[PDB]
Design a protein around this ligand. Structure first.
Ligand SMILES: O=C(O)c1ccc(NS(=O)(=O)c2ccc(N3C(=O)c4ccccc4C3=O)cc2)cc1
Ligand SMILES: O=C(O)c1ccc(NS(=O)(=O)c2ccc(N3C(=O)c4ccccc4C3=O)cc2)cc1
Lengths: 178, 255, 56, 269, 255, 255, 269, 56
């Protein structure tokens, strides 16, 4: 799911018990293996510092009769990621109600104790956890496929700045190109 | 701006957007605001929780069956676990709150059903035994939905609540519950109910871990119904947010 | 003439005089601050205003 | 100088600056204030060390060759291209078209070669780095009339001094250097593919002026490029898969990302 | 005027109306216009094709399968057959063009899928053999859609293009192709993509029968999917229109 | 007003009056105030605990023996149990605080002794093992006083802190600790120390359940001494009050 | 410019500027005039050579490593910290928080190593000192792609010239470098203690560009730091007991003072 | 511009012109004279006046 077009799609299916986790990844661009090859992350690997908000636009590419609500939550570092929706609520969340305008922007605000953060891994500073939970299960009528998809998009805000240039680690060479 | 299908309620950190719904039902005509000095009975200094006890606390989801009786959640006792609301009510003798009770339920366009979302202030429930009072563990939730039943609860020496949908567990006809602020979640079109409760009590401020000033009741008047196949699990999720919280008399942790 | 401009400060003055005939031998334009993200971001014909949905 | 946050507060009107289709190819601008409430925060952060020029204006080593001072290859030759080093190349290939001047600095360092020659003593080798414009003459033997530098630029550098530096202006037939050319040079669409004459600043040859020591000495010319006065147009994806050739975009397919465990894991493998 | 679902692009004789879609994505912020005298490198007199080489030339339709790799059409070499655009590029040494690339695909409301419609200027494709260049008959279309594959093209001595959806045949991650002007054709809602390319090149005017300045790529990110039965053949039809064409140096017919 | 023996510090509900003492020592010349927008690194909305997390939290009393080594209490980790300060630091990622550290000890006029009350910001303690770091259960209190010793802590593989009064467990001469704001509680006359700490850190706001910004140390420089008989148990009681608390990033309960 | 004394004379009133409790944490200011009488004395003494900056702005050697030009360790590596030299470290640890720019000067001196190699003749070794920002790539073999200095700063210095100098600005995640950190990096309070990411300016690697002489040569890179534009906050006790570790404040207990004889002796032992 | 200031004399004038783009490459501020011992010394709330005893 890392050698096909299966990588980009996040499987969503109707599950009877609600509180199931859709996805979950830490926010730590330019180190996290989820943002390591994205456009934002690849610019970020040429810099040692970064500061600013990050926008995660989730786009529902299901059927046109499928519905569902999702509780998209970002829980700052203070504990080790929610494992229940009832814990995820307490963070900074946005309940996305689908039905026209097939995208909803969960904007992750700047919560850090410093005016910059490292792009490379460090433990003096961390970026918390981004999780998604079902708020209200995917209700799909008859003759409509019960497995839909969501797409996640990463973009920078306008309060964004990078400082101190270094050179990437994700490019290499051995002998010169003949 | 454009269509009224959209709404977006931002309180603190959490936002609830809904693609499609209707108008917000505002209280009795009052929106919760802080208590002024001409109503303040407390002589002590109150705290201001502000944004950190005004987020939308998402209570337990419950699954709506094809035929299901209904549900109710007490209001200061569904939030006595979640976040800092559950803390503050225990460290403080007096508390004053308003609410944004937002009940959200989605369904496909081949499903039908219709919930009545009322908020009954001061719902004093009867009892199966006609001379005993309810228990405090059947009567109250724990943030869990308690559900009624469609047949009378049999009498004995039990202290279980009298639970029948049609009498609402209070001994009033269910069809008259609409006086109180409410809304309907008709699955045909309109997929949420927003009811803004302002603080309602006979005294200006009251303890919340002994008195439950509001009781949300979600009663399906038209059972969920559909054809064979499709999906068969349409949950109802409740997101409640305290609004204009204010406490006084900083005691110690209690019951 | 001597071009005097503030050093890039966070939160002063340096003389610089070009000494070569060509203008392709002058020091880099490290200071040259401009931003205009109305290009690649939001290239749409009619700008979507943030107060209503983009689609009808 | 970046933007600032301003106080907001509750929102209950039909505004929903969050919900908006991203199907229209429009990347919406959403601030902190839209998904919560955030007071007035002043930001003094600076988005300078992120300018197009400052990004590209860093000297990167593009190449290095070796040439014996007494034997066979007494001269080195290089067709100028930034396509010999992965590091500089990937930065340039982040833009479709770039325009710039070059600063060529050469860091020539000599190393004695093991031999049984008696009384090897150097008398400060002097190196000549010569630029031959495209369609110039081509030296063969190191004593050829070509090395007279009649019009061809050359830097003469005595060893043990500050490394030679020279500028080159923007020299292109077109109005920008193309970092990606889709097309052939031939009208019948055969031959070379994207070997267009716009990024071909001739050749650069280097050799020992003197005969150095009695013994053999091998010198290593290291070439440094530094883009000044940069203007870059049309942004494009950075290269993913590793480079294979110095004039083609050939590649072997590889991963789309670095793998981890499940979709809900919170730790990279 | 009213809903934004409507759009109507009239260029010359042919009009493309669409009942439902979204906004037109305009270039990098530039709309194709004629080249002024302060950019004109040609010393000869240019022609003006006007309306007769600005109609929407409808290229080959291709059928989207349930799982299909993706497609690409080179831009000056998909129109090298159709109408007077195919003539003019051959009688004239230099040409300058803009485009209106309009990709149209309809689907029912029980179908799902999502195309990415990008327009990559200067798509220089790699090759299966790591030391050979592509052929000119695999690399280019003929107004036909060339399609990628989901498995690496095996190496040998072949000059067939390296075709893998996830590397886009260029050796760049497919997920980063969105920088370039584009749009999505999410079948849920939005049934066309309109991308207005302005002339983009390093030189002011260039031969079009040797250089391909734009490459349209239509890549399905979410495969087409539906239930059993219904219809099983949802084509994607491309309508491209030259815009602000201008030629120079009236030679003779060639290759 | 009249004698300076009197002082009275009222913060919220609790007041500390003292019949006899001296002046209040104010920080480095700064009194804790809220962080302004020109220092605010957080982009989120902070809470205001106000009076309900600004009361004088009375930590554990410790008994001063005739000869006793000294004591220290870490500052964000002595209040990680008491009241709402202990809650807030756990529900919030970032916190910012000032303090009123008031050390009170009474004695009769036939007793003598002299405490040094310093507040060392950033007391990074050494370790008995010269290549291991301290544990988090020896180094920190639990609102309990940790006490030093007058003999070197023996080395081994132990991670117990190096505790010797004369080096202050930091490797600095004890006699030089007076730079930092402090006061003396000379039992001859002056029976309390009041030290008003303003927020001191390199960053504007920092997590408090992983970083301890202040460390109070109470070191007896002149041992308690008296004649035979009388009373033989003169405790030292610490009352600390947070001042101008402010939190951000409302996460969930943690460590 | 310091203060001046002024004439006083006898005092018999209830003033007693001497008697005052020092129990209040207030360090009283008493002049000569208060305990005696001293006429007007003008002082022209200057309290400049005692300013916070001038104190700290002196180049101190922080470290030095060695690297063979032909053998195994052909490169040296150093994680930048002032915690490797006792001298500079104690000055910095006189303040809790400091903010400053650095001037890095490297004094590279080469020494020939004894060998039986024939005809050893150097051709002016050129050294490369390279700064790798925190979270950069890490070279292994000295020929690794890493040394291309694509974006990473580097000074190229030919031996027998003025020693290389470069500046570094204030680079800290926070707004001051913490010289003492009480806390862990991990939320569970384990692992490293006070190894916070604010005083970790990456690594600095150095190597021989050329192959030098035929024989082995070992070079010694000596690193000098010089704090410019210093601002220092929160004063604190100077270290007493000797340093034990380069990242901890570990110590062995030792004397409180140097001993002498009795309490009334007038001569130090 | 040229900043002219007196040499540190005991009991004159030097031109100095910053030549670098950054302001983190300017020569140290060796001259920067200020003293304000009302901080660490006498940090008390109400200043004790030298004419009577601090305590009552
Ligand atoms: O460097 C160039 O400019 C230079 C070097 C070689 C060259 N090529 S040549 O025209 O074939 C040529 C080849 C050799 C000599 N040449 C000799 O044969 C000789 C013998 C003794 C003393 C001097 C010289 C001397 O110059 C001169 C010219 C032209 C110029
Ligand atoms: O210094 C760096 O920038 C530099 C040094 C090593 C390096 N690593 S590499 O990509 O593994 C590499 C390794 C070796 C060579 N290389 C050779 O193998 C060689 C043989 C003969 C002549 C020249 C060369 C030459 O460069 C080129 C690149 C990259 C850059």
């Amino acid at each position: 799911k890392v050698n096909s077009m299966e990588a980009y799609q996040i499987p969503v299916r109707s599950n009877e018990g609600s509180g199931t986790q859709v996805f979950g990844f830490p926010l730590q661009p330019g180190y996290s293996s989820v943002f390591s090859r994205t456009l934002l992350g690849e610019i970020l690997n040429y810099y040692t510092h970064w500061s600013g908000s990050i926008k995660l636009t989730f786009m529902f590419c299901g059927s046109a009769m499928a519905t569902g609500k999702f509780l998209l939550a970002y829980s700052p570092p203070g504990a080790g990621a929610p494992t229940k929706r009832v814990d995820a609520m307490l963070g900074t969340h946005v309940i996305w109600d689908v039905g026209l305008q097939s995208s909803c922007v969960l904007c992750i605000p700047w919560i850090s104790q410093t005016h910059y953060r490292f792009v490379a891994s460090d433990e003096y500073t961390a970026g918390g956890f981004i999780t998604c939970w079902y708020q209200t299960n995917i209700v799909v009528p008859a003759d409509a496929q019960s497995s839909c998809y969501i797409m996640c998009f990463v973009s920078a805000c306008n309060d964004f700045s990078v400082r101190l240039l270094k050179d990437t680690p994700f490019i290499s060479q051995q002998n010169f190109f003949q | 701006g454009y269509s009224d299908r959209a709404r977006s309620i931002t309180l603190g950190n959490s936002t609830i957007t809904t693609q499609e719904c209707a108008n917000v039902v505002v209280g009795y005509g009052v929106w919760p605001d802080y208590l002024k000095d001409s109503e303040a009975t407390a002589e002590d200094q109150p705290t201001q929780p502000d944004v950190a006890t005004c987020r939308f606390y998402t209570l337990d989801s419950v699954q709506w069956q094809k035929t299901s009786p209904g549900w109710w959640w007490k209001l200061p006792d569904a939030l006595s676990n979640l976040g800092l609301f559950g803390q503050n009510m225990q460290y403080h003798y007096l508390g004053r709150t308003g609410y944004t009770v937002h009940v959200q339920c989605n369904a496909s366009k081949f499903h039908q059903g219709c919930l009545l979302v009322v908020c009954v202030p001061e719902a004093e429930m009867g009892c199966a035994t006609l001379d005993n009072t309810p228990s405090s563990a059947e009567l109250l939730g724990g943030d869990t939905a308690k559900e009624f039943a469609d047949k009378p609860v049999a009498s004995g020496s039990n202290k279980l609540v009298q639970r029948v949908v049609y009498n609402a567990g209070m001994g009033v006809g269910v069809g008259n519950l609409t006086i109180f602020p409410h809304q309907w979640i008709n699955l045909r079109t309109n997929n949420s109910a927003t009811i803004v409760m302002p603080y309602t009590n006979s005294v200006p401020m009251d303890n919340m871990f002994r008195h439950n000033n509001v009781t949300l009741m979600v009663i399906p008047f038209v059972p969920l119904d559909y054809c064979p196949g499709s999906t068969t699990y349409v949950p109802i999720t409740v997101t409640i947010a305290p609004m204009c919280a204010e406490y006084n008399g900083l005691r110690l942790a209690g019951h | 003439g001597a071009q005097v401009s503030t050093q890039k400060t966070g939160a002063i003055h340096y003389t610089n005089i070009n000494y070569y005939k060509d203008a392709a031998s002058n020091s880099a334009n490290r200071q040259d601050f401009t931003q205009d993200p109305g290009k690649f971001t939001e290239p749409v014909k009619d700008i979507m205003i943030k107060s209503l949905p983009a689609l009808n | 100088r970046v933007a600032d946050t301003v106080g907001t507060g509750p929102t209950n009107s039909e505004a929903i600056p969050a919900l908006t289709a991203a199907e229209t190819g429009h990347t919406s601008q959403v601030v902190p204030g839209d998904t919560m409430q955030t007071r007035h925060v002043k930001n003094y952060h600076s988005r300078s060390e992120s300018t197009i020029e400052n990004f590209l204006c860093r000297s990167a080593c593009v190449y290095f060759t070796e040439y014996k001072n007494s034997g066979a290859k007494r001269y080195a030759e290089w067709v100028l291209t930034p396509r010999q080093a992965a590091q500089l190349r990937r930065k340039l290939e982040f833009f479709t078209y770039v325009r710039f001047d070059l600063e060529l600095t050469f860091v020539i360092t000599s190393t004695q070669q093991p031999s049984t020659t008696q009384n090897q003593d150097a008398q400060i080798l002097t190196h000549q780095i010569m630029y031959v414009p495209p369609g110039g003459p081509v030296p063969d033997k190191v004593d050829s009339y070509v090395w007279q530098t009649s019009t061809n630029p050359s830097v003469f550098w005595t060893e043990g001094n500050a490394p030679p530096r020279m500028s080159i202006p923007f020299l292109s037939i077109g109005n920008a250097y193309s970092n990606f050319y889709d097309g052939w040079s031939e009208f019948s669409r055969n031959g070379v593919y994207g070997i267009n004459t716009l990024n071909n600043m001739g050749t650069l040859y280097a050799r020992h002026v003197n005969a150095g020591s009695t013994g053999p000495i091998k010198s290593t010319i290291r070439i440094y490029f530094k883009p000044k006065h940069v203007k870059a147009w049309i942004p494009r994806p950075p290269r993913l898969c590793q480079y294979e050739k110095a004039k083609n975009v050939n590649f072997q397919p590889s991963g789309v990302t670095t793998t981890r465990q499940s979709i809900t894991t919170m730790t990279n493998t």
